[PDB]
Amino acid sequence: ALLSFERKYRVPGGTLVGGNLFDFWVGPFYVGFFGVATFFFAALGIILIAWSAVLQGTWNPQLISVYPPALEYGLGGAPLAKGGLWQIITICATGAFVSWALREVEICRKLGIGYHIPFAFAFAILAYLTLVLFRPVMMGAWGYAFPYGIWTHLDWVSNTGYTYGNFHYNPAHMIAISFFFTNALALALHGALVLSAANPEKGKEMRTPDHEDTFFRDLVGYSIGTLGIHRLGLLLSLSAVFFSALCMIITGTIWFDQWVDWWQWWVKLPWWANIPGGING
Amino acid sequence: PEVSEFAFRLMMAAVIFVGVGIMFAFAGGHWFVGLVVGGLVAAFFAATP
Amino acid sequence: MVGVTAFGNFDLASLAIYSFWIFLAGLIYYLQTENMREGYPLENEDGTPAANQGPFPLPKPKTFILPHGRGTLTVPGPESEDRPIALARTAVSEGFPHAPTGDPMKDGVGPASWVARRDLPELDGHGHNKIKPMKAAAGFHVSAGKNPIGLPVRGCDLEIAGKVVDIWVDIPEQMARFLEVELKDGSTRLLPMQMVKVQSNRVHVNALSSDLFAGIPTIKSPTEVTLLEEDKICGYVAGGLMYAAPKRKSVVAAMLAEYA
Amino acid sequence: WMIFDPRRVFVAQGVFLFLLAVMIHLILLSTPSYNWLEISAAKYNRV
Amino acid sequence: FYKIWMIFDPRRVFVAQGVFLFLLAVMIHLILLSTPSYNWLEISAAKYNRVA
Amino acid sequence: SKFYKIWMIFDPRRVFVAQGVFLFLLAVMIHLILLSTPSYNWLEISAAKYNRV
Amino acid sequence: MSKFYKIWMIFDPRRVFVAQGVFLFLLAVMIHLILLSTPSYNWLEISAAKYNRVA
Amino acid sequence: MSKFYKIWMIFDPRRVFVAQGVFLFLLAVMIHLILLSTPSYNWLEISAAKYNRVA
Amino acid sequence: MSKFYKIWMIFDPRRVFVAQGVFLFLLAVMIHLILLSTPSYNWLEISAAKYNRV
Amino acid sequence: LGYTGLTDEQAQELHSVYMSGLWLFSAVAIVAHLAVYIWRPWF
Amino acid sequence: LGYTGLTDEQAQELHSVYMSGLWLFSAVAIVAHLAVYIWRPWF
Amino acid sequence: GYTGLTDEQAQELHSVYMSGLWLFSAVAIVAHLAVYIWRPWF
Amino acid sequence: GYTGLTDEQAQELHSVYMSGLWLFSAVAIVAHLAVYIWRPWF
Amino acid sequence: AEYQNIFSQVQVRGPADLGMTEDVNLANRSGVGPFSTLLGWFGNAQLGPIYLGSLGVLSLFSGLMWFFTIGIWFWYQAGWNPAVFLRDLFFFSLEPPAPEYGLSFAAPLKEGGLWLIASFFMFVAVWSWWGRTYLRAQALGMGKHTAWAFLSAIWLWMVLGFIRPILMGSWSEAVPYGIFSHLDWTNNFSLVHGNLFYNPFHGLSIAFLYGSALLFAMHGATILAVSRFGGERELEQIADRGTAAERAALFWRWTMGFNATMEGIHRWAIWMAVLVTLTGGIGILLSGTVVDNWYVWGQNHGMAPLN
């Protein structure tokens, strides 16, 4: 149940809460206090999603949907069959995510590595809380959050996007999309480059980081370096999530019209607004 | 309480950006000029702390 | 072919989605088997092979031809620690921590662990040493940022433990890797650049207290550092984070220990 | 002065004083009252 | 008042002063042009009946 | 006057490249401004003068 | 004007020639496309109207 | 053509030949596509109308 | 034309042959596709109309 | 010269073989164009 | 002079072959343009 | 001399380059005269 | 000197540069005069 | 706070690295460019040298011509006015031919022909760049993984611009050139085919794009966490497994029950990124050709409530 090198790393300590009360492993998983919390919240959320499937009347996993309370309920509680289950599952999900991050903190402390992984997960948790907690609270209703269904939260995304015309024109959305695309491109390039260095042409020696830098300089004239590429990947993903959270937190709170109407400000600058010709003239 | 040269420089750059942006947006006919001037000043100040 | 179904609602789109589910299952199998090339077969907490080995079997071995005539590496293959592990079982049942028998930072266990790698320097593409002191690196110099050479080195206990004498740089990457620090006794240790915070006046090392700086493993050659020495130094410094905690003078830690 | 770096203190003080002065001037210009340019134009029949 | 040069780098202060002076001059000129009054271009245009 | 010593400060290669790029960009911008205006658009002027429409 | 040859002592002839070739081709393409865009001087459309190529 | 041969003293023949081939192919395709774009000189449509290939 | 063989003294035959093959295939596909795309010279549709397949 | 290391005799032989292949290809293309022009002229 | 390493004789021979090819290409292009202009003038 | 070529080499290169430039300008002037005769733009 | 050129070298470089600038200015002035005759803008 | 290794706290600069010479023709490689202190704070400061080969020259010429064609069309749409050009830069568009022309190349130059010219230039540029990636890998003896990942990206690009317009029998199906114009094309493509969200392959493409973001966040965070053990030198960890690779593997094993290797994580990375464009190309190819309304298709396949 242990890797060939895991034995020397399984030592007491690093726990945030509980000392040695939960300082143990179940199979490969390290439990800890926050692991106990994460498992409880996850099991409760999954069982409540199954129960909401029972209440809804469908067992098809793609049709299972846990809708938030309707806008009539505001930010208060709702009956479980009509929005309260969504609130409980949201609380369970937030608890599970935060417990997962803190369990990762405990594992980082035990292994003596930096806290970059829980810190990066905190960004995803913040984007989730923007979608389910911060934005609905700012707008004043839990019905502005998305349902917990495989294809119904896509309906939420579609309706929220088309509320503001074409959502492509949200500028923070544009920045987040560019970050996402660049992150996917950089991940493809990085995986491919490391694999090409480590799996060269058959019968040839394994390559070195010098070969990787030479390849990318001969390709695009610049090489960011191994440390550089890993920093870039982390920053691209985190910036994408940060700007998506920003785009959703400004939408419906400080912006209410179509976003192309936002883009009209550049067109109507005084020195070229009235010039005929072009597209907006 | 442990701010270094870069951190304090960036905080002051942000304050200068916001202030100059508001000031020039009020001065100019649009907020674009203020935003651009404030951003450029902040970037120049933070480039060489 | 809009609406052309072979049977039921199964059309070209359904064919594509099911074939992709099959392909994704196969790809996950392939990726997991590729990931199973290190750390396997699984072992018990005593060392013997475990009864459970996982649903995914071991992949057929593959050989890497190491550069610069460093031999070959076949994975998966017979791998052992090749070092005594100073840990004692804290419970007969599996899944519990192993307590260090002596000083874990000296024993190299826990967060202070290190791996018995090749006792040879890491080489660049041309065959020269990858990491070299900046004095022995032709033309290398500090280009930007605060120069750490000459600054005092402060431990986690807020006590000066030496001064920075030289910077060890990675010649291909052209980035600093290790700071050479002279202690009070005149000997020199290495500190990973990722574990030191170069401030305006001093270099702060939150991982190690001052008295632990002497315990850092030394390099057998003043001009080159091997992979084994790098691993030992990095393991010692990082394990200082969890094992020099009593000596660390953090205010939040002091307040928490006040109520704990 | 002992706790804080003199350069940072002076930079912050100067920036804050300039920002406050320009903010007060702009507040005066915005409001119809105490707006010197507008009252000067009205008095001399500029507009 | 000369001791302020004992604490601050003269080159940085001079560069910042030049940028600040140019920014303030541009701001004042833009404020003057913003209002219909004192906008010397518009004032000259209306005075000489440019728009005919 | 003694302007030649400006080359003791400015690298001739970078200065010449920047000057060439700037001159070409400025000339193209001015020509495009002239083309944009209905007057000085010599193609349109010749079309109207010789009845090319 | 007699000392213009000295420009080759500052600029590498290969880079200058490559840049000049690219520049001249781009300029010629730009001018030709400007002429094509205008209804006048669009020599293809002019010849079509002159010889009644309209179908 | 007095002393143009000296250009080969400056430019590698392989690079120049590759660049010239790429340039000529791209230019030829561009011109043919421009001709196909214009309703006149679109030889396929010209032949279609000439022999009444479209009903 | 008698001195053209000297191009092989300059150009590597492997890369020249590969580039020529790729270019010729791409050009042939391009021209056949252009012919197919036009209502005339679409030999399939021409044969369909001629023999009244439709 | 001598970038590829080929000799004048070898280069001339290779050029002869290449030109033979080119003439075969061009002959087939010319036959094809004659057949298409007879079937459907484009001029 | 030394950028390419060719001699004056080699450069002259290369330029002669290149100009022969260029003149052949230009002759074919001129014939093509004459044929197009006769078939459909563009002026 | 950043390029490094001698003055004689620079002189010869400039002579050849200016010859090519004058040939190019002669062709351009002939073309412009032909276009102006065909369709003047002034 | 950031470039390291001698006084005579820099002087010669600037002399030929100014010759080029004066030629460019002369051509620009001729073009502007031709345009102003053809279509004045004042 | 401690040093998070996000930005280098000190820069060292030495001789410019000219790169390896496995089988690369050094004549075609340019000289080293300037060192950027700003870039050095994050990665390598060295710019260049770049390899300018035959395929590199072809790709650069074709891409320059594509960019210049789009720019000249934009200048025409601006009335040659620099102010209008800057005002409406994102609103200009080089639209494909109208549907009446089908796939024919007879569309007028200002009504679709220029789009065809620009598309030919882009096609040649992209494919020559793919050949360039393949040959740059081949000259150094490295594997062709970059070539195949780029081939996945090219597959999506070809489906969007070439294959799907051919299967639909109209160039009007292709993507216009322009910022907001191609955004509008994306939106209209979703609307016409009935809520592309219900495309299962679009859903998979989004799953793998989110997985790419998640996996690059995880991998960058892991390598930055273990960089104190020299974890950034990943090829070394593949050849000689240090404590960095072991600590990363144990972190992920204790967190989620399974881990990767220092090499296998990059297989995960390349496949997670490749499947984005692979599933995306398949989903776009199916739209219109096989499924004309994805919401009705989802209803018939139990993905939507009604039916």
Ligand code: BCL
């Ligand atoms: C209203 C809009 C519609 C919609 C319509 C579409 C359409 C239409 C498409 C997508 C596609 C995608 N969509 Mg969707 N999409 C919507 C909502 C979403 C949401 C969301 C949260 O709501 C998300 C996350 C996504 C996510 C995604 C991606 C997974 C996918 C694109 C992959 C990619 O990288 O493409 C971008 C990458 C490329 C196009 C590859 C480019 C490769 C070439 C080689 C690059 C050449 C570069 C060129 C030469 C320039 C060089 C510059 C120089 C180097 C300087 N969509 C809604 C429902 N979406 C695509 C897809 O595959 O769908 C199945 C697609 O075509």
Ligand SMILES: CC[C@H]1c2cc3[nH]c4c(c3C)C(=O)[C@H](C(=O)OC)c4c3nc(cc4[nH]c(cc(n2)[C@@H]1C)c(C(C)=O)c4C)[C@@H](C)[C@@H]3CCC(=O)OC/C=C(\C)CCC[C@H](C)CCC[C@H](C)CCCC(C)C
């Ligand atoms: C910030 C950059 C990206 C990021 C980063 C990131 N995510 C991370 C990490 C990091 C660095 C981890 O360390 C951690 C991890 O361990 O990954 C393997 C995690 C993680 N990222 C995850 C997924 C994930 N990340 C996503 C996104 C991203 N993660 C960002 C793009 C997405 C999407 C949609 O984009 C998903 C699905 C998990 C694999 C893992 C967190 C595991 C976890 O929290 O487990 C406990 C929770 C459960 C087991 C869920 C069931 C129990 C819950 C109580 C019920 C929740 C129901 C849910 C609300 C229903 C939603 C249904 C949908 C159809 C609507």
Ligand SMILES: COC(C)(C)C/C=C/C(C)=C/C=C/C(C)=C/C=C/C(C)=C/C=C/C=C(C)/C=C/C=C(\C)CC/C=C(\C)CCC=C(C)C
């Ligand atoms: C918004 O405001 C509006 C637009 C309404 C009105 C504008 C208002 C404002 C704020 C305007 C601002 C104006 C300003 C600040 C103008 C400043 C002008 C300056 C500073 C001009 C200076 C010019 C100097 C020149 C051109 C010097 C040229 C020098 C040479 C040609 C010779 C150089 C060569 C040398 C020194 C040789 C080198 C010597 C040695 C020994 C090496």
Ligand SMILES: COC(C)(C)C/C=C/C(C)=C/C=C/C(C)=C/C=C/C(C)=C/C=C/C=C(C)/C=C/C=C(\C)CC/C=C(\C)CCC=C(C)C
């Ligand atoms: C859009 O524009 C359209 C398409 C409408 C119009 C098209 C325009 C354009 C740009 C058209 C382009 C036309 C061109 C440039 C065509 C070029 C054709 C050529 C050059 C064809 C060459 C063919 C040659 C062949 C097939 C040669 C074959 C050779 C062999 C089979 C033998 C090779 C083997 C050898 C030499 C072995 C000997 C080896 C040793 C060692 C002696």
Ligand SMILES: COC(C)(C)C/C=C/C(C)=C/C=C/C(C)=C/C=C/C(C)=C/C=C/C=C(C)/C=C/C=C(\C)CC/C=C(\C)CCC=C(C)C
């Ligand atoms: C938008 O604008 C439109 C498209 C409307 C109008 C277009 C305007 C423009 C900008 C047009 C541009 C035209 C230009 C610049 C055309 C240039 C044409 C040239 C310079 C063509 C040169 C062709 C040369 C050829 C075909 C040479 C062939 C040579 C050979 C076959 C022999 C090669 C073998 C050798 C040299 C043997 C090697 C020798 C030794 C001693 C080893």
Ligand SMILES: COC(C)(C)C/C=C/C(C)=C/C=C/C(C)=C/C=C/C(C)=C/C=C\C=C(C)\C=C\C=C(/C)CC/C=C(\C)CCC=C(C)C
């Ligand atoms: C101002 O300075 C100047 C004018 C000099 C330069 C400025 C240039 C500017 C302003 C450039 C602007 C460029 C922009 C905005 C480009 C936008 C591109 C976008 C957003 C593209 C998006 C999608 C494109 C796709 C999917 C393209 C797909 C194309 C293909 C798959 C190739 C299709 C190939 C075809 C049709 C070949 C047909 C031809 C033949 C001969 C068979």
Ligand SMILES: [Fe+2]
């Ligand atoms: Fe990596």
